[PDB]
Amino acid sequence: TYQLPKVWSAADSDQGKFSGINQPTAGVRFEQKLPVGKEPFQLYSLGTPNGVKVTIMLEELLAAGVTEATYDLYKISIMDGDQFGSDFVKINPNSKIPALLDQSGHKPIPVFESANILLYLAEKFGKLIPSDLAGRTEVLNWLFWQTGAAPFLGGGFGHFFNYAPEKLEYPINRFTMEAKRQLDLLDKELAKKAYIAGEDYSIADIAIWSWYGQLVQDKLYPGAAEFLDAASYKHLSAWAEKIAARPAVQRGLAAEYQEIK
């Protein structure tokens, strides 16, 4: 039996793979100057579900003839703690990738949260979200949905299934049930629509594919697709395959992250 204290103080507690990285405090841990290249967009990121959203988006824009959507891509190693460097924290004080700088204009604009970066780029160039209120709203319903759902998938299911030191039954069941509910939701939606927000591929599809599409394609945690009965979600699976064959998606996944040190 573990005793719950009145006031929590276990700063040194085991956090699995991210022991040392995870802390009860935020902010800068060391001085860091990040490189800045010539392209309008500087992307400080890593090839994770959240990072690939942004390279995919940029490649989709490039593939549609938006010539300004070129970017410099730099590797932020989250296991090394690069996300706690002074320059990175300036861009994203939450110390998570992806983080972006738009230096197309007079002064650079810092953008973080992967879904927000997708929205920012979509509105800047008028691509991959409808310009009519009804269509825009439905994309946003699902884009925000993804932002609020993925934490359970990655931070709940993924953590306990793959990165916690012991396999803990109760958390795994709790978070697996939620992951399945989410998969079932998306499957049932995609049984009625070509893409998540209707007839047209959108930033919501990019956001959702990067987590749920890769998941059911068995590209994420080892054994997870099988554990979750991924193949049983036929409409989600068919949509994930369709999106995986887009050239911009393939280029987004294959993008080269340059060293910062």
Ligand X SMILES: N[C@@H](CCC(=O)N[C@@H](CSSC[C@H](NC(=O)CC[C@H](N)C(=O)O)C(=O)NCC(=O)O)C(=O)NCC(=O)O)C(=O)O
- Which parts of this chain interact with ligand X (CB under 6 A)? 18, 21-22, 48-50, 78, 83, 95-98, 113-115, 147-148, 150-151, 154-155, 158-159
Q: Which does 48 bind (CB under 5 to 8 A by kind): ligand X, its own copies, none?
A: ligand X
Q: Lay out the site mask for its own copies across 54-83 (x = CB under 8 A, - = otherwise).
A: ------------------------------
Three-state secondary-structure class, residue 130: coil
With CB under 5 to 8 Å by kind, the binding choice for 122 among ligand X, its own copies, none is none
Q: Tokens representing 15?
A: 């956090």
Answer for which of 23, 254, 258, 261 binds its own copies (CB under 8 A) is 23
- Binding residues among 174-193 for its own copies as defined by CB under 8 A: 174, 176-178, 180-182, 184-185, 188-189
* Total of residues contacting its own copies (CB under 8 A): 74
CB of 3 to its own copies, least distance (A): 8
- How far is residue 175's CA from residue 54's CA, in Å, rounded to a whole number? 26
Q: Hey, what long-range contacts does 218-226 have (CB within 8 A, 24 or more apart)?
A: 220/49, 220/158, 221/158, 221/161, 221/162, 222/162, 224/157, 224/158, 224/161, 224/162
Task: Tell me how far apart the alpha carbons of residues 238 and 249 are, in angstroms, rounded to a whole number.
Answer: 15
The listed partner (its own copies, ligand X, none) that binds 158, CB under 5 to 8 Å by sort, is ligand X
What does the CA dihedral 218, 220, 223, 227 come to, rounded to 10 degrees? Answer: -80
Collapsing DSSP to helix, strand or coil, 182 comes out as helix
Which of ligand X, its own copies, none is residue 229 near (CB under 5 to 8 Å by kind)? its own copies
Alpha-carbon span 96 to 78, nearest angstrom: 8
Q: How far is CA 165 from the centre of its chain?
A: 24
135 binds, among ligand X, its own copies, none (CB under 5 to 8 A by kind): none
Distance from C-alpha of 206 to C-alpha of 200, rounded to nearest angstrom: 12
Beta carbon nearer to its own copies, 124 or 219? 124
Binding mask 133-172 for its own copies (x = CB under 8 A): xx--x--xx-xxx-xxxxxx--xx--x----xxxxxxxxx
